[PDB]
Structure formats: C-alpha cells, structure tokens
C-alpha cells in the first residue's frame, strides 16, 4: 500500500519499486532500486504523483517542496537509530551525529506551550513527549533544511519551528525613546541581544535612527525567548524555565540544556547533572509569561 501521510493509505498492486510507484521509501530507506519481495509485499511512502496524494501531503505536512519527503525519510533513517532516554521526566536524545542542538531543542519544547500547525508535527510532538521522538526529530530536520550531522543553532531551529506554529495570539508592544511598535507572532516571542527578561522590561540601549533605549510595554504570550551571544551567565532557582548552554567555538561548539526544577538540572545528552546554582556560558534563556503590562 502507498501512503503519503500514513493516515490515508491507498492500495496498490520483479519490476523495481521506483519504476512502478516513483520514489518509494520503506522505514526511511529508499527502495527505489529494490525489487518487490514476498517480505516487502506493507506500507510504503511515495512522493505524490497524483492530486489526491498531493492534497493529502499538504494536509499533513503543509509543504509542497517535493524534496521534503526525501529529506524527511533520509533524516528518519538516522533518528530511529538514536536512543531517546528520559531524564528527569523529559525526553532527551543520546548524543549522536551532532544532535546536541536537537536534544536541547527537544528538551526545551516539552517545557514550553506550543501548538504546531502541520498535523505531522503535532502528532510527532505528542509522540515525542511520550518518549517516541524519532519522527519528531526527523521532521525538525526536514522543515529546517538541515541534514543529519550538520551543525545547527538552537535559536534558529526554534525560529523556524515557531514559524510553523500558532503564534497569532502572541503579541509584543515595544517603545523606543516616544515611538512604540507592535510585534506579532514569532517576533513577539524572540528577542536577540540580552538574556535577562527583566532587563528587556527595564530597557536596553539600541541604536537610534536619529542618533536610544528599547523597553517592553506589553506581552501577551505563553512564553518569551531571550537570546544573546554566548557569555558567562548566572542562573537562579525559579527565575527561568530553561536555558541552553553553548561551550565551544562558532558552529563547532557543543549544546547543553539547563532546566529549573526544585534544583537546577543540567542535561547533556543522556547525562544529567544537578546543582543549586549554575554559572556558565548561556546563549538562550526561556521565560514563562502569560500577560505583561508595563508600569511605565
Ligand atoms: C552550533 C552552531 C551551528 C550553526 C550555526 O549557524 C549560524 C549561522 N546561520 C546563519 C546559519 C551557529 C552555531 C553556533 O555556534 N551558535 C552559537 C549559539 C553561537 C552564536 C554566536 C552568535 C549569534 N549571533 N551573534 C551575533 C553571535 C556566536 C558564537 C561564537 C562566536 N565565537 C565563539 S562562539 C556561537
Ligand atoms: Cl502553510
Ligand atoms: Cl505551518
Ligand atoms: Cl519563568
Ligand atoms: Zn502550515
Ligand atoms: Zn546516523
Ligand atoms: Zn530619532
Ligand atoms: Zn532555591
Ligand atoms: Zn554537539
């Protein structure tokens, strides 16, 4: 049977699989060169060749890029080989093929409230919290055009993931000095420049178009992401939801994830380290907000 979304299966009935069905993938491995066998007979992924499959493909993945299915299947061939151990109630990834940014992003995703627009992302996202995050990690690579082993940046991975999610209800009003602007969607949840969410509310010096300082006026969202170039940062118990640590040179460095439970927990792959106070190089800090109205 040939399916493009795995929730809409179509029946089909020597000649290589590629000449019969086009590009054919079984369990994330190309069987285009492979011939039919009595063992193969099952369910095979195929790039859509008719409008019925093209419509079903968009309904599940929300993309029409034909290379998407091939890159997703190729990424899935590696992710299912990875082990996904659960540490401190969170589904992480055992480090393999430079996935330190994937695991840090996966740990951060389970702790922020997010609804994905494509059903493929959402179904795998629920499966990811359950412990089966193979399809979810492969989809992340496919939507981000990143390949397995490629060096990935967490705040960029989040940026593309936030674009494929419902952030319409998120909103941010910023005033720079008196001129205030409104940011909606991904811009409302992300800011590059500083890690302290308090500093963002108090004001940050920004280049004036005339010459200014930038302060937050209103924030209606379920969370806020604060990004900055990697620098030594002090993390206190209860001030942050989670953070991402970067230790190394540009692109080459390793990614580590710190979360704030009853004590600060630090997750590197499958390893977990606990400390009451943690000071280290941090590039992204995540904060939980529901509504903010400035006192200014
Ligand atoms: C792992 C990785 C993979 C891919 C990747 O791609 C980026 C290019 N992209 C456009 C495709 C980046 C990274 C990556 O090293 N990220 C860390 C967080 C980082 C960031 C920044 C940074 C971000 N903004 N500014 C203004 C500075 C600086 C450094 C360092 C500089 N000197 C020593 S460390 C490290
Ligand atoms: Cl879309
Ligand atoms: Cl989408
Ligand atoms: Cl918080
Ligand atoms: Zn969409
Ligand atoms: Zn691999
Ligand atoms: Zn001015
Ligand atoms: Zn404490
Ligand atoms: Zn790494």
Offer a quick outline of the entry.
With about 300 residues, the chain is α+β, with helices and mostly antiparallel strands. The protein has helices spanning about 15-20, 50-60, 65-80, 100-110, 120-130, 135-145, 155-165, 185-190, 195-200, and strands at about 1-5, 10, 25, 30, 45, 85, 90, 170-175, 180-185, 190, 205, 215-220, 225-235, 240-245, 255-260, 265-270, 270-275, 280-285, 290-295.
Structural features, described:
The protein has a seven-stranded mixed β-sheet with strand order 10-13-18-14-15-16-17. It has a five-stranded mixed β-sheet with strand order 2-1-5-3-4. The protein folds into three domains: 1-46, Papain-like viral protease, N-terminal domain (Ubiquitin-like (UB roll), Roll), CATH 3.10.20; 47-170, Orthogonal Bundle (Helicase, Ruva Protein, domain 3), CATH 1.10.8; 171-296, Jelly Rolls, CATH 2.60.120. The protein has helices spanning 17-21, 51-61, 67-79, 100-111, 119-130, 134-143, 154-163, 186-189, 197-202, and strands at 2-3, 9-10, 24-26, 29-30, 44-46, 86-87, 90-91, 171-176, 179-184, 190-192, 204-205, 213-220, 224-235, 242-247, 254-260, 264-268, 271-275, 278-287, 292-293. Helix 5 (119-130) runs antiparallel to helix 6 (134-143). The longest helix is centred in the N-terminal third of the chain and has 13 residues, at 67-79. It is globular. By secondary structure, it is an alpha+beta fold. Bound molecules: the ligand Cc1ccc(OCCN(C)C)cc1C(=O)N[C@H](C)c1cc(-c2cnn(C)c2)cc(-c2cncs2)c1, chloride ion (3 copies) and zinc ion (ZN) (5 copies). Ligand Y2N binds at residues 151-153, 156, 229-230, 246, 249-251, 253, 283. It is classed as viral protein,hydrolase/inhibitor.
């Amino acid at each position: 049977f040939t399916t493009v979304d795995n929730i809409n299966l179509h029946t089909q009935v020597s000649m290589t699989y590629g000449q019969q069905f086009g590009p054919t993938y079984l369990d994330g491995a190309d069987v285009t060169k492979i011939k039919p066998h009595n063992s193969h007979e099952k369910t095979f992924y195929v790039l859509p060749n008719d409008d019925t499959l093209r419509v079903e493909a968009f309904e599940y993945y929300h993309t029409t890029d034909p290379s998407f299915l091939g890159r997703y299947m190729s990424a899935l061939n590696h992710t299912k080989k990875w082990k996904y151990p659960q540490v401190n109630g969170l589904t992480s990834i055992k480090w393999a093929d430079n996935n330190c940014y994937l695991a840090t992003a996966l740990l951060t995703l389970q702790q922020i409230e997010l609804k994905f627009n494509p059903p493929a992302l959402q179904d795998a996202y629920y499966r990811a919290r359950a412990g089966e995050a193979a399809n979810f990690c492969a989809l992340i690579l496919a939507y981000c055009n990143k390949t397995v082993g490629e060096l990935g940046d967490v705040r960029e991975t989040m940026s593309y993931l936030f674009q494929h999610a419902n952030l319409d209800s998120c909103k941010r009003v910023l005033n720079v000095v008196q001129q205030q602007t409104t940011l909606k969607g991904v811009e409302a949840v992300m800011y590059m420049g500083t890690l302290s969410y308090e500093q963002f509310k108090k004001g940050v010096q920004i280049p004036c178009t005339c010459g200014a300082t930038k302060y937050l006026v209103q924030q209606e969202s379920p969370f806020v992401m604060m990004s900055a170039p990697p620098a030594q940062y002090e993390l206190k118990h209860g001030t942050f939801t989670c953070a991402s640590e970067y230790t190394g040179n540009y692109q080459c460095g390793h990614y580590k994830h710190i979360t704030s439970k009853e004590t600060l927990y630090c997750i590197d792959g499958a390893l977990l380290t606990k400390s009451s106070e943690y000071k280290g190089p941090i590039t992204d800090v995540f904060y939980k907000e529901n509504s903010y109205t400035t006192t200014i």
